[PDB]
Amino acid sequence: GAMGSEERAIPIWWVLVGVLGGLLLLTILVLAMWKVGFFKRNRPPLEEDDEEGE
């Protein structure tokens, strides 16, 4: 046996359960990228003291 897959059915549940976690991944990814830029400005090393200048 080989090319044929006697499981001709393609259970969408399985795909759904995976696509469902893709929403779970979509959110963690969306955040992680949001972090790749929202954690950049949170400059915690005391940057510009008074207003902007030198």
């Binding site: 393609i10 259970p11 696509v19 969306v30 949001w34």
Partner: protein, 79 residues
Amino acid sequence: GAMGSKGPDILVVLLSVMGAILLIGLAALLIWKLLITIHDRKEFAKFEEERARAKWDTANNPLYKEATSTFTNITYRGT
């Protein structure tokens, strides 16, 4: 079940499923990437916008420093 069936493999079919998750996030990644980047395009623009007018609005306007006028002062002349 013990992690999917046993005779088959469920690995190949699952491999495709996982791709969708990764792809569904890569598609949303792009959309949200512009949401966080576009928030800056405004200041980034307003930034270079001020540096553009400030010059044309200072590289040739030494009348203000004087007071608020120059010519059009027709009156009793002398020297």
